[PDB]
Structure 1
Amino acid sequence: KFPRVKNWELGSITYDTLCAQSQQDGPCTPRRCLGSLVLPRKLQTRPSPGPPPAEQLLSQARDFINQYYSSIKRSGSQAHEERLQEVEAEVASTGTYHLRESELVFGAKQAWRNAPRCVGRIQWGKLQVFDARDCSSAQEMFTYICNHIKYATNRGNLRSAITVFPQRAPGRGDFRIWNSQLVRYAGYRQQDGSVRGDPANVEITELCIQHGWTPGNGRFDVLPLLLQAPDEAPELFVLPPELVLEVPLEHPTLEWFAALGLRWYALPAVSNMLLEIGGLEFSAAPFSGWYMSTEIGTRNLCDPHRYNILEDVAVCMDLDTRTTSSLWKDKAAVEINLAVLHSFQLAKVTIVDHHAATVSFMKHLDNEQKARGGCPADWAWIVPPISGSLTPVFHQEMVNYILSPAFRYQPDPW
């Protein structure tokens, strides 16, 4: 009933009992495992043709309120009893309900804690939660967002934060941020099929232009935001450059690296996921932390479908690009990740390397085994994209499952 979980480096064994608290089904079955798929349409939180059934909603809300009071140890207080009755009252008459701010703050931190793809969860207790539920216009969202970013960047001393915009309502369209992150580089599909900039952002770049943006022509042009208030066309907002802290990439010993003209932005802020707490859904709730260097040095700069700089750097290093067996790719990638760490350190911008980060996740796993009898984790996302078995999490068996509060994928608004 409970998985036996082994760490093959240390020989230690634990049992995951927390997984019995899952109530949402993942994509696997006993007949085939789909653990490596990025998004099955299933766990995804898509639009609906009306208001959720009140029984389901109140089951999730009761469990959540139950989590909250257990969390402040008044589980069973009259406050508890009373809050449950308010929630019951509000659902039965309106089909929905509202969270108290302190509940929202607990719920956002628990959603991060529960995120099986996040290797940075040892920080989960440390999150600035901005309540933006009194927002009624795109213009307003922009102001809250600009405030998120100033707070979170903090001159390079990054601090984790989330801004929560108004929940989804049966009666209307959603508040959405169309960009997948608050900071994104444009991707221009020049004539010859090519792409200048970040190919991951060709479609959003196109939407921006189509919605009146005047495009640049560089490899790192920061896109404007497309922000959407319920049932209205999204509106275009250009971020103040002063708010977007960037790091030009240099290498500690290769002189010519700086000449590649490469850079990346300081703040990782995901803006297209849905935050679910107690059955309520926040379709606009951007969150940010700081980067793990492999995100930049390895995936964003060396993926074949991204900036794909591996061969340029190898040729620069005078590597033998003729055969696979010279390991030119491996060698170039190491230096590019080294350049990322060097540059952030030099610019005094928070960053964490993949060894430090996975070591801290191992400690986090230990903490959560004690605290809750397990930790949901997605092995393929937790092991880094370089040097996998050189890190401790490679040798660690992991159990993956969905707990709520949760961050979830949702359909693109367009």
Structure 2
Amino acid sequence: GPKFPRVKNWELGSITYDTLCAQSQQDGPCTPRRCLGSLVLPPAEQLLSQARDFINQYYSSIKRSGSQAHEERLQEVEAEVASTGTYHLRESELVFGAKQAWRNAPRCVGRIQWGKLQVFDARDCSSAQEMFTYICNHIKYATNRGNLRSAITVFPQRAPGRGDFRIWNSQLVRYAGYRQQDGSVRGDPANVEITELCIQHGWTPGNGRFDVLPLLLQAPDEAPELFVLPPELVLEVPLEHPTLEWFAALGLRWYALPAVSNMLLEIGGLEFSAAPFSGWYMSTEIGTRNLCDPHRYNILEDVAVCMDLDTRTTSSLWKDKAAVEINLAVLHSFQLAKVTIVDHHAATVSFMKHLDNEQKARGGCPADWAWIVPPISGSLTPVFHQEMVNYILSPAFRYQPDPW
């Protein structure tokens, strides 16, 4: 056979070989001695080679590879790096790179959508106040009264000696998590640290389970500033169940727009430290992880009690039955509100289509099996039966250290 990873689908019996992994310039956490794939978190001349590589990728995607426009852009990029130490992307290069970073994200099941991304160019932004305006506009555009649209807003790149643009919040929409006297948490335990930072920076805290946090925005070399989102901008969905009439009484809800704001977008060696992006939810993110993780809202026991299940024994499958109904409530409620959402069956089926598309387009697709397989009903989805090869390609979305 070919000298490339052989990838098998065990449901269908089909085989492919990944040749794209050959284009990986960056090491992962694994070695011949041990596999670390389950771990969550495992320049000068350097810039120029990353830049040359990215420009070659751009010129391939417009089919002008080896041409005069291609050779002039390279010379232009090295001249700029030569005199300034950095360089700058053309508008169309940024748009290409941002889509390629999404397309490249091994943990993302939503990649069938990768070609459809609204790129807002905010590289002119010069204050925390203006970042706020740009973010409001992003939310308005992306939310679109419930018919959600993928979008990314790109703020100025990191630059020699000058401080970064940073959004401190991990998402544009987050519920407060208030540490209680009895050591427990009201609201979202995930958000305890950012909540306390918000208070330290002068926010007057509420005391509910679903208080929307303000934003902490940091323009270069300045302390962050606090901004409250106008509530009419933040679309939320009250949760009800289609047949269990009491589920509405629980007063649970979730926000419509997942908008990740703490990741670094790297393109051609350029680092965009503030570049929030949004799409729509897969229903298990809300119904399984957010609401049922023991370290999150942890509502499984409450719902099972309402359903009159035997919570005293594992073999009743009370957890499984409750999680299913919570997921159904999420789907039903979003549908009723006409807010875009995708169930884990439709998402994974679309992802199998994406795999095939990318096999033909590029000879493979980097994918992180543990993240792609949904957290309920894994083997009921077609991705469970699909082998996957994980590797890092650039442009990339990367984790970056918290700014405090």
Regarding TM over 0.5, the answer is: yes
Query: Structure 1: how far apart are the matches of 2:295 and 2:221?
Result: 34
How far apart, CA to CA, are the structure 2 residues paired with 1:123 and 1:32?
Answer: 34
Structure 1 runs of 4+ with >6 Å offset: none
Classify the secondary structure of the residue corresponding to 1:255: coil
2:96 aligned residue (100, 106, 109): 106
Is 1:403 the counterpart of 2:393 in the alignment?
yes
Shift in Å at residue 171 of structure 1? Answer: 1.6
The correspondence for 1:12, drawn from 14, 30, 38, is 14
Distance in 1, Cα, partners of 2:385 & 2:182: 45
**Aligned-pair CA distance for 1:75:** 1.4
Give the C-alpha shift of residue 358 in structure 1: 0.1
Question: For residues 170 and 387 of structure 1, what CA distance do their matches in structure 2 show?
Answer: 48
Residue among 192, 205, 215 paired with 1:215: 205
1:333 is displaced (CA, Å) by 0.2
Q: Secondary structure of 2:402's partner? A: coil
- Separation (CA, whole Å) in 2 of partners of 1:76 and 1:3: 30
Query: 1:231 and 1:2 mapped to 2: Cα distance?
Result: 47
- Give the Cα separation in 1 of the matches to 2:190 and 2:44: 40
- The structural deviation recorded for 1:62 is 0.6
Deviation at 1:347, TM superposition (A): 0.1
Alpha-carbon displacement from aligned partner over 1:19-71 (angstroms, at most 9, x marks no partner): 0100111111111110001112xxxxxxxxxxxx3211110101100110111
Describe the superposition over 1:125-184 as per-residue Cα deviations: whole angstroms up to 9, x where unpaired.
000000000011000100000000000000000000000000001221110000000000
CA distance, structure 1, for counterparts of residue 35 and residue 218 of structure 2: 37
Task: Supply the distance in 1 between the matched residues of 2:69 and 2:386 (Cα, whole angstroms).
Answer: 42
CA distance in 1, matches of 2:305, 2:358: 46
The Cα shift of 1:228 comes to 0.3
Cα distance in 2 for partners of 1:78, 1:19 equals 29
- Output the CA distance in 2 between the equivalents of 1:137 and 1:32: 46
Q: 1:260 aligns with which of 250, 265, 276?
A: 250
1:241 paired to 2:248: no
Equivalent in the alignment of 1:229? 219
In the TM superposition, what whole-angstrom CA distance separates every residue of 1:307-366 from its partner, at most 9, and x where no partner exists?
000000000000000100000000000000000000000000000000000000000000
Deviation at 1:245, TM superposition (A): 0.1
User: Aligned partners of 1:242, 1:63: CA distance in 2, in Å?
Assistant: 44
- Could you tell me how far apart the structure 2 residues matched to 1:133 and 1:382 are? 32
1:365-394 Cα distance to aligned partner (Å, 9 max, x none):
000000000000000000000000000000
Question: 2:50 is matched with which residue?
Answer: 60
Q: What SS does the aligned partner of 1:343 have?
A: helix
Cα deviation for residue 93 of structure 1 reads 1.1
Secondary structure (helix, strand or coil) at the match of 2:354 reads helix
Query: Matched residues in 1 for 2:44 and 2:215: separation?
Result: 36
Deviations 1:182-205, CA, capped at 9 Å, x for gaps: 000000001100000000000000
- Partners of 1:76 and 1:323 in 2: CA distance: 67
- Following superposition, the deviation at residue 77 of structure 1 comes to 2.3
2:118 to 96, 113, 128: 128
Residue 35 of structure 1, aligned match among 34, 37, 57: 37
Q: What's the offset of the Cα at 1:76? A: 2.1
- Structure 1 residue 297 displacement after superposition: 0.1
* Deviation for aligned residue 1:79: 1.1
In structure 2, C-alpha distance between the alignment counterparts of 1:94 and 1:358, rounded to whole Å: 46
Q: How far, CA to CA, are the matches of 1:96 and 1:309 in structure 2? A: 50
Q: Which runs of 5+ in 2 are unaligned?
A: none
Please give the secondary structure, in 1, of the residue aligned with 2:246. helix
The Cα shift of 1:98 comes to 0.3
Hey, what's the Cα distance between the residues in 2 that align with 1:32 and 1:136? 46
Partner of 1:259, secondary structure, is helix
**SS, match of residue 368 in structure 1:** helix
Report the count of equivalent residues.
402
Q: SS at the partner of 2:202?
A: coil
Which stretches in structure 1 are left out of the alignment for 5+ residues?
41-52
Which whole-Å CA distance do the structure 1 matches of 2:401 and 2:27 have between them? 19
SS in 2 for 1:130: strand
Q: Please name the residue that 2:25 is paired with.
A: 23
RMSD between aligned residues: 0.5
Overall identity of the aligned pairs, in %: 100
